[PDB]
Structure formats: C-alpha cells, structure tokens
Design a binder for this molecule. Structure first.
Ligand code: A1B0P
Ligand code: CL
Ligand code: ZN
Length: 571
C-alpha cells in the first residue's frame, strides 16, 4: 500500500509543499485520495477534405462529429473461488501456449529511440519533446535511477496523469516498453501465434478471418461488447496477466515483476479538478498502462474470459461457487484436448471479440462472464446473447464485411462502415500549428486509405481521386498502413488484394481501376452513399471545379488528374 505508493506521493507533496490542501470535499469514493495542489486539445476541421466533400456540409451526422467520468469511479466486486480457479488454470495454460514459439526478451533504448524518432503514441507528458530527451544522457541517468529502484522493489516517478487515457513521463514509458514491449514488438497476439488474435492484420485481412471462423461447424456468431472493459479489470485479472513473468529470467523477470507490482497492481494518478487543483489519488485494480501494452493484456484476458464462457456453454463445470478436484482435472483436459481448436473459433482485438461456439448453449452461459465482472453492454445481466446468422452482418473493430465478386470471378472480402463516419473522421485534424501543406498531406493519407480499403463505396472512390488530384502528386501522406506511401495506388492495391492475399489463388494483376468492383448501388445506399441525390450528382459532374479551387489555394505545384481513372470522366 503506502509503502509502495508513499515515496511517489511524498516526492509530489514536496514539490508542492505550498498548496498541499487535503480538501475534505473530494469527489472520490472508490479511489483513495491523498491531497491536492494549485495548477492551471479540441477537434479542428481539415479544409482540404471539407472543400472536396461539399454535399456532406448539410449532413448533421458528418458536421456534428467536428463540434465540442462515472465509470472510472466504479468498484468491481471479488470473483467467487470457482471463477478465480477457472481464470488461474486458463491463464497458466494460455501463457504456456503463447510462449511455445516465442522467447520473452527486454526491448532496448535503441528500439525506443527509433520509435520516438519515427513519431508514435507513447502517451508521454526540461525537454520540450521526447525526440530531445532521447538524445540527452541526463534523461537516461534518470531512467537508471528509477530502474535500480525498481530492482530494489520500489518506485519514485512512475505516476499517471488522467485526461480515459493515462499519460506518464517518457522514462516510465521506456521502463514499461523495456519489460513488456516484446508482447507487441514480437507479435505474441498474431493470429499464427495466438489463434484468436489479429495483431498486425489490416482491414483487408479481418473480413477473410471472420469468413474462416464462419466455416467452422457451430452455432451463431456472438459479438458481445463489455461495458467499459478497462474499468472492469479486477486485481485477479492483473495477477493472471503477471504470470507472463513466470516465462522470463534474470534481470528481465525482475524488471517485469516491478512494472506489474509497482505501476499496474498499485497506481498513483494526478487528475485536473476545476473546483483548478491537481488531485493525487491511488487504487489497486482497473487498466492503466501504455495504450500498446493495454492492447495485448486486453487481448490476453479477453481470450481467457471467452474460453471460460465457451467452457460454461459446453458444461465443463457446473457452478462458479466452487470447482471440485475432478472439475479442475476436466478443465485442464478440455484445454489440452480442444483449447487450440476453441481459440481458432474466435477473433479477438483487445476488448473486442467475435466467437463462433460449438452450439448456441453459449448464448445463456452468463455466470462466469458476469462474475469475472465482464458485464455485457446494452442488455439485461441475465438475458441471453443474440448471435448473428451471417458473418457479413457481424460487427468487429468498428466494421462489417462484404463479399464482393470481381468481373473475373475472384472474391474480395472488403471492410465497410457507415459512410457518414468515414467522411466525418477525414474532416477532422488533431492538434494545432498545421501548415496548408501538412493539412493537404493528412487529407491525402485519408484519400489513399479510402482507395485501398473503401474503393467499393462510389462516393469515397470519387472523393479519394478528387483529393489525390487536388494535392501535389509527390507530396508525402502524413499522420497495417499500406496507404502511407508515394507509390501508385493501383500498384499498392494489386500487392495488397492479389499478390500478398493468401485467400486469392489466381495472382493475375489488375491493369486498371475499372476492373475493381463496387457494392451494389442499393447496398451502397444502405451503407450511407448519397448516390441518387441531386447534391451528389452536381458534386460529381462539377468535381474539376472543386479540384481547381483547392489547387488555386495550395498554389503553382505539380498535380496529376486521377479522375479519368473512373469511366464517367474517361471521355
Ligand atoms: C491494427 C489494429 C490492431 C493492432 O494490431 N493493434 C496493435 C496495437 C494497436 C492496435 C489489430 C486489429 C486491427 N486493427 S485496426 C482495425 O486496423 O485498428
Ligand atoms: Cl444475422
Ligand atoms: Zn457496408
């Protein structure tokens, strides 16, 4: 407790000896409050994308996206003994399986520096930017001090800042990356290694993966969301995740144990409270880690929970209250006998899952799932899950997936979501100080993503071609990301959908964009197309005038006309 968090608490109080007010009106119940001290990033519109998507200026679902808790202060109960036993047995077996073909290892200062020098979200807070602290040895001396302290089993500076997303100073992030970065850097949650995972799988992969799950004999496909997954991570979950250290050795094992003990299973956080003080609060459970370590540990614990729910549906155990000695044997024998087969019936991306169980008993197998605290979103606690009968209607990673047959008979499985969401996101830039050139290169990144993933949506292929025509041809797209390149998008399309696509036997390249199909016109409208509206017809017909408006603003640069890549503009 205070023996582990005290030092961190003391150091902050000292730097705020003046203003250390123990407010007696603190709003925290489930967080432990310690003290306070005196202190003092909205959406911005991308003008390049907006000028080239004029019909959407009058669609509230698009325009409202650019305008403008009671979950974090909740307390999850302690799982029953039978549940705790199911979780420990499953977790032990799952780390063994994930470790069979992987070797845990420390990630290096050298690896961390490259990442920072390639700009990535390390959710970090003397040095202005991380790119600077990484080139100054003084920061690394600070890392050494905390590191040696971690080897002592104590912590000084690994403190969270709330905003939910939990930022730390770069030094704490390095220590987390050095101990646990291997999970992501060496692809422990790849589909090949984990069977349920999809780490490294682009949107041109996910629909084919759902279709492969659909081919298994079984019941409906279930895709139940958890209500605030991060807030429902129990201290028992944090202890099963820590068992990854059992696969480690020497220094690494010690360093990993310290991240789990001192930063995850005990947390210190600073929150901005307008009534404007900074509150120093602590607690033991819930998810607060780097977003990338959070992804892999979410995937792990979700894989564990869904195998246990599958066990409950198959009747492997009778009640969560208490597991008999023989029921433990049975659970272990199920895992050994069919565990890998049951993992292959799932697609799991952090807190997001799709499960095709052995049959529909799974729908009403709710006791372990509720008792683990993984309570389903938008459904009564004991109401049976509603499954999907068609893999093309299953939601996963904010998408659904269409089966699309090319004029030459080959099959594309394409990602899709409501088009208002796609256009609304492309119209938003994050942060400030953007030049016109940098705003244009972000618009081009969205346009090239649309050409690669959403080519089958009439409005996005036309808008992508218009943006790529309006932005200098050689300007590089800014902020898998196969669209982040200056290479010709037809060549990238061929590499992604044909050459490298393991579900495509015939490798005959496509010679033009007109060989590449669209959804049916009615399906396109169902998924939010404006095709058939007067606003959209005038936009399409007059598109060269919009392209010329943006070219005039950017100035006298080298531009390519991509519009004739489409039949209607091809004379
Ligand atoms: C690439 C991710 C995800 C992944 O590999 N991540 C590792 C840590 C951050 C997320 C895998 C599923 C697919 N998506 S998605 C739908 O493109 O966002
Ligand atoms: Cl359905
Ligand atoms: Zn669709």
């Amino acid at each position: 407790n205070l023996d582990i968090i005290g030092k961190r608490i003391e150091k902050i109080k000292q730097e705020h000896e003046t203003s250390w007010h123990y407010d007696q009106d603190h709003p925290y119940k489930t967080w432990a409050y310690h003290g306070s001290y005196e202190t003092k990033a909205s959406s911005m519109v991308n003008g390049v994308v907006r000028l080239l998507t004029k019909p959407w200026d009058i669609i509230p679902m698009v325009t409202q996206m650019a305008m403008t808790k009671e979950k974090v202060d909740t307390r999850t109960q302690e799982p029953k003994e039978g549940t705790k036993k199911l979780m420990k047995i499953t977790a032990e077996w799952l780390w063994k399986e994930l470790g069979k073909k992987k070797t845990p290892r420390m990630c290096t200062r050298e690896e961390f520096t490259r990442k920072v020098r390639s700009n990535a979200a390390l959710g970090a807070i003397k040095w202005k930017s991380a790119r600077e602290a990484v080139e100054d040895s003084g920061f690394w001396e600070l890392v050494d001090k905390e590191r040696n302290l971690h080897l002592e089993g104590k912590c000084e500076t690994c403190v969270y800042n709330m905003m939910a997303i939990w930022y730390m100073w770069l030094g704490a992030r390095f220590l987390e990356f050095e101990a646990l970065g291997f999970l992501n850097e060496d692809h422990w949650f790849s589909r090949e290694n984990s069977l349920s995972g999809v780490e490294g799988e682009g949107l041109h992969k996910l629909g084919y993966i759902l279709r492969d799950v659909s081919k298994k004999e079984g019941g409906a496909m279930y895709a139940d969301d958890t209500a605030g997954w991060d807030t429902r991570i129990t201290l028992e979950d944090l202890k099963n995740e820590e068992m990854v250290t059992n696969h480690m050795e020497g220094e690494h094992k010690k360093l990993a144990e310290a991240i789990f003990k001192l930063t995850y299973q005990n947390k210190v956080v600073r929150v901005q409270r307008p009534t404007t003080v900074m509150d120093i609060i602590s607690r033991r459970d819930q998810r607060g880690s780097g977003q990338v370590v959070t992804y892999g540990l979410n995937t792990f614990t979700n894989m564990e929970a869904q195998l246990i729910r599958q066990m409950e549906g198959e009747g492997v155990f009778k009640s969560i209250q208490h597991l008999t000695v023989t029921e433990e044997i049975a659970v272990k024998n199920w895992l050994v006998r069919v565990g890998r087969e049951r993992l292959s019936r799932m697609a799991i991306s952090g807190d997001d899952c799709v499960v095709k169980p052995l049959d529909d008993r799974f729908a009403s197998a709710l006791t372990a799932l509720n008792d683990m605290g993984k309570v389903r979103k938008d459904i009564q606690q004991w109401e049976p899950s509603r499954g999907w009968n068609d893999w093309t209607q299953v939601p996963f990673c904010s998408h659904h997936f269409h089966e699309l047959i090319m004029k030459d008979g080959r099959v594309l499985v394409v990602p899709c979501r409501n088009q208002d969401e796609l256009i609304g996101r492309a119209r938003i830039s994050q942060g400030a100080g953007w030049s016109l050139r940098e705003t244009a290169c972000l618009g081009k990144s969205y346009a090239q993503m649309w050409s690669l993933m959403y080519f089958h949506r009439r409005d996005l292929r036309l808008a992508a071609n218009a943006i790529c025509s309006a932005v200098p041809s050689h300007w590089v797209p800014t902020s898998t990301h196969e669209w982040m390149t200056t290479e010709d998008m037809l060549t990238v399309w061929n590499r992604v959908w044909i050459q490298e696509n393991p579900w495509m036997e015939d490798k005959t390249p496509v010679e033009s964009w007109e060989e590449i199909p669209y959804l049916g016109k009615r399906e396109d409208q169902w998924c939010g197309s404006l095709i058939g509206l007067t606003s959209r017809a005038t936009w399409a017909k007059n598109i060269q005038t919009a392209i010329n408006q943006v070219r005039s603003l950017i100035g006298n640069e080298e531009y390519t006309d991509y519009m004739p890549s489409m039949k209607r503009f091809r004379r």
